[PDB]
Design a protein around this ligand. Structure first.
Ligand SMILES: *[C@@H]1O[C@H](CO)[C@@H](O[C@@H]2O[C@H](CO)[C@@H](O)[C@H](O)[C@H]2NC(C)=O)[C@H](O)[C@H]1NC(C)=O
Lengths: 225, 215, 97, 106
């Protein structure tokens, strides 16, 4: 038993949102079996949208009543979900699950899909250099970062390389935050102080792999020594 | 409308010990139809126990449920590193059903002094009319920390979102980033920008600042 | 970025083997390389470099071992300082000889 | 564990060792090595007059009997050097005083 979701990755506010839950391996003929939708905004808990039983029996949430519609098609074996009056605060990932009886609720879960509701467009990310202004305190090591801004949807992977195309293990990845209708993220890397006062390499390159452009700006080291 | 509240929000446990999760309901649930779910960030939630007393297929026997009415407790014997995820309690006797806030369990560790670094906005970024000042906190414990922005002795408010990373897999520490956003015209009207960091393991607050034009 | 000053000390005219000290002061950044030359020939042994200390400015001192007979023969000793891609050479000799 | 008399050495600038805006200035180096115990007193004398300013003494550092070294630097003026002034380095070690006299005369 497995479930698969599908739908648009970007929808404008105050529009119509449609999602499809693809399942195969069972039929909604026996009693107790049902399909439900659960969403979870980032940093929040699960939210119950609606649940539909057999014999075309559907249940809706009073907090969201008269705003959602549940339709099923046994021919294609997939439930259709329609969402109207889209709001930026309602952005979340939607999941569907199968209930195998009256007591075993949501036994199998799919994978879900991120549906971003932003008035903006999917523009290429913008990188900005970061210069460390630390002074009078070299401390253990020095840090240099890379500010990826104006990206949508939030799907970015960070990799750090030296001037000679080496490999660096940073693993410092900060989650994105919705600020002014756009997602912003920050990434840094830790480098030893000895290497700064050594090789002639005075800068490193910041690389981001986003499906809107393959730009890669370089962040120059401030050098303190 | 059954309101479910879970407390405490965050608890620090150690591997091998016993962890007890509390689930509070706003009213009695018919037939004690309360179930527990396990969710890991990135992946999808998985069912563990249905009906608060019967486990499901592919679930270890170390998870046990107890209680009835409006009080439910989840006991887990033999805590494992992979079990440090968020857990939710949900009842299916409401129709429509409701979900709780959820509780997160973290690995208990010693207090480590954080590292504070501030990067002034680049000249290229200033050309776009937006200035971004960052305040980075790394290698601190516990997750609870206060980050306040003070510029020209004036405390700022209502302009900091605050982003915090998850627990490190190999270091068990936490990291967070604070971003300062202000207009380009307002940026030129201020000289010194500083973010104050307060930590439990620090005797006195440490403040870092920079001078405009020297960086 | 400030060019390092090169100064070479010589043994007293009225007598002292001896040592040659080349000092670079008021230079930035901290890393700096100091070597010695003898009549235009590279020196492979007999010289040591002390750890760089903080006087922000830094200070570096080096010691070269020389013999009295070589000094009296009007041998030329040159201190080579490399800093930010620039090379500075200072030549000294006995005043009374 | 042992007592050894310190060795006093004085370094003087060459004839072309003066630079900078007029009046030019230079430095004098007095170093005591292979002395024990670690405590030692270094003083600078100029024509019999004690020098109370313009000098910096480096901390004693370690160079089998234990050995130590001390480096002292005194700033001097070109005009004073041209007047055949004699500079004497005063070293005190376990109550013993050692004096070294240097001059520009050949
Ligand atoms: C690229 O240049 C860097 C210099 O910053 C090299 O790093 C040095 O080489 C060793 C061996 O790879 C590294 O482990 C050290 O970080 C550096 N050495 C010292 C003494 O600190 C790096 O190796 C170069 N890349 C490649 C592929 O050779």
């Amino acid at each position: 038993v497995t479930l698969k979701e599908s739908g648009p990755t970007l929808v404008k506010p105050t529009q119509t949102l449609t999602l499809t839950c693809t399942f195969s391996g069972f039929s909604l003929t026996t009693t107790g079996e049902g399909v439900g939708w659960i969403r979870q905004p980032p940093g929040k808990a699960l939210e119950f949208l609606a649940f539909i039983y057999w014999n075309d029996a559907k249940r809706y949430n009073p907090s969201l009543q008269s705003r959602l519609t549940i339709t099923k098609d046994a021919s294609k074996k997939q439930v259709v979900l329609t969402l109207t009056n889209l709001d930026p605060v309602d952005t979340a990932t939607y999941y569907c699950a199968r209930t195998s009886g009256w007591d075993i609720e949501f036994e199998y879960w799919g994978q879900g899909t991120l549906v971003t509701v932003s008035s903006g467009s999917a523009s290429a990310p913008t990188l900005f250099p970061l210069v460390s202004c630390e002074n009078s305190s070299p401390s253990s090591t020095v840090a240099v970062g890379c500010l990826a801004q104006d990206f949508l949807p939030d799907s970015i992977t960070f990799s750090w390389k030296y001037k000679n195309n080496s490999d660096i293990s940073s693993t410092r990845g900060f989650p994105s935050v919705l600020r002014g209708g756009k997602y912003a993220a920050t990434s840094q890397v830790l480098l030893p102080s000895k290497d700064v006062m050594q090789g002639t390499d005075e800068h490193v390159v910041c690389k981001v792999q986003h499906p809107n452009g393959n730009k890669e700006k370089d962040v120059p080291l401030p050098v303190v020594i | 409308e059954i309101v479910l509240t879970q407390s405490p929000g965050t608890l620090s446990l150690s591997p091998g010990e016993r962890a007890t999760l509390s689930c509070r309901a706003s009213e009695t649930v018919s037939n004690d139809k309360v179930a527990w779910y396990q969710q890991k960030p990135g992946q999808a939630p998985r069912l563990l126990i249905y009906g608060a007393s019967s486990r499901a297929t592919g679930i270890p026997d170390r998870f046990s449920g107890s209680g009835s009415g409006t009080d439910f407790t989840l006991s887990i014997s033999g805590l494992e590193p992979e079990d440090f995820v968020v857990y939710y309690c949900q009842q299916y006797a409401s129709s429509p059903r409701t979900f709780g806030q959820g509780t997160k369990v973290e690995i208990k560790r010693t207090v480590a002094a954080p590292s504070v670094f501030i990067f002034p906005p680049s000249d290229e970024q200033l050309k776009s009319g937006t200035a971004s000042v960052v305040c980075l906190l790394n290698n601190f414990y516990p997750r609870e920390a206060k980050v306040q922005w003070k510029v020209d002795n004036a405390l700022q408010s209502g302009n900091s979102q605050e982003s915090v990373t998850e627990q490190d897999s190999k270091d068990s520490t936490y990291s967070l980033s604070s971003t300062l956003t202000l207009s380009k015209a307002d940026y030129e009207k201020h000289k010194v920008y500083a973010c104050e960091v307060t930590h439990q393991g620090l005797s006195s607050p440490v403040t870092k600042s920079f001078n405009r034009g020297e960086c | 970025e400030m060019n390092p000053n090169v100064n070479v000390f010589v043994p007293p005219r009225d007598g002292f083997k001896s040592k040659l000290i080349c000092e670079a002061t008021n230079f930035t950044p901290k890393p700096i390389t100091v070597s010695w030359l003898k009549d235009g020939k590279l020196v492979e042994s007999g010289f040591t470099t002390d750890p760089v200390t903080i006087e922000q400015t830094y200070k570096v001192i080096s010691t070269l071992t020389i013999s009295e007979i070589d000094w009296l023969n009007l041998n030329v000793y040159t201190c080579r300082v490399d800093h930010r891609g620039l090379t500075f050479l200072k030549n000294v000799s006995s005043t009374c000889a």
